[PDB]
Amino acid sequence: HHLQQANIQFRTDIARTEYLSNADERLRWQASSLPADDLCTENAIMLKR
Amino acid sequence: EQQMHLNVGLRKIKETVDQVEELRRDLRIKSQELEVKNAAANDKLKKM
Amino acid sequence: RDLEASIARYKEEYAVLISEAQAIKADLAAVEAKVNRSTALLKSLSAE
Amino acid sequence: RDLEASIARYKEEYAVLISEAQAIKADLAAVEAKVNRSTALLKSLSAE
Amino acid sequence: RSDLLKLQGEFQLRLRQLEKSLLQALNEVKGRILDDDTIITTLENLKR
């Protein structure tokens, strides 16, 4: 809402997880017993970056 | 980088379609010259 | 004898240019097959 | 019409086979060039 | 369900790899696509 109010463009359609990681990284993550959850995927993204 | 890759691919595809068109033209010219060669050949065969 | 020598030379030369035409024909067939293969590849690449 | 039909087969398959005869003549010339080049190389490699 | 989740994961990986390979193959080709038939064969294999 702050960025919309400030006339700053950003993609709303794309979610955080696939924007911050590629499919190969995610697949390796479930290969590494990462639980299949959006929050767990975000946690893995933070643990990487 | 993905934009440059896609531009390269599209350019290559357009070059390829232009090449196949000019190669159709070359094939037609080849057919015509082959036909005229064979015709003269058979004419002088009847001469022999 | 003179007309028979005519036969010899001219007929040798004409069989020679006939083989030349047969060669240009194999080349033309290869070109046509290449054109067909390329067109198939290109109409397969429309989606990309 | 019968004789001309017989000719309008025989003349050209014998033209085709004389064409392939000159094709194998070109093959034989290539083989001979390969042979003499190879023997020159071998006689130049005797000291080695 | 577990088997087909694994199958779908492998399949999506394979589609990604094929698309990337096709892009890089079109990118790295030198000259024209039809100059060499290895590019044609690789593209046809990737399509199939």
Nearest alpha carbon to residue D23 among C21, E37, C30: C21
Which bin fits B45, alpha (ψ -120 to 50), beta or left (φ > 0)?
A: alpha
- Dihedral pair phi/psi, residue A27, rounded to 5°: -60, -40
User: Any idea what DSSP says for residue A35?
Assistant: -
Q: How many CA atoms lie within 13 A of B39 on its CB side?
A: 6
Query: Which amino acid is residue C9, in one-letter code?
Result: R
Distance CA E19, CA E12 (A): 11
Number of other residues whose CB lies within 10 A of the CB of residue E26:
23
Distance CA D19, CA C15 (A): 8
Give chain D's count of helices (H) and strands (E): 1, 0
Distance CA B10, CA E27 (A): 10
Chain B: list its partners (3+ Cβ pairs within 8 Å).
C, E
Among the residues of A1-49, which ranges form H helices?
2-5, 16-20, 23-31, 38-48
In chain E, the residue whose alpha carbon lies closest to the alpha carbon of C31 is E34
D2-31 as b/e, with b when 16 or more CB fall inside 10 Å? eeeeeeeeeebeebeeebeebeeeeeeeee
Q: Nearest 5 degrees, angle CA B5-CA B6-CA B10?
A: 120
Is the separation of the CB atoms in C13 and B33 below 8 Å?
A: no
Distance CA C6, CA C2 (A): 6
Give chain D's end-to-end CA distance (angstroms, integer).
70
From chain B, which residues contact C within 8 Å (Cβ)? 9, 13, 16-17, 19-20, 23-24, 26-27, 30-31, 33-34, 37-38, 40-41, 44-45, 47-48
Nearest alpha carbon to residue C18 among B41, B36, D23: B41
Nearest alpha carbon to residue A20 among A2, A3, A41: A41
Is the separation of the CB atoms in C41 and E40 below 8 Å?
A: yes
Method of determination is: cryo-EM
Crossing angle of helices C2-44 and B2-47, in 10° steps, is 160
Q: What is the resolution of this structure in A?
A: 4.5
Residue D27 in 3-state DSSP? helix
Is the separation of the CB atoms in E40 and C38 below 8 Å?
A: yes
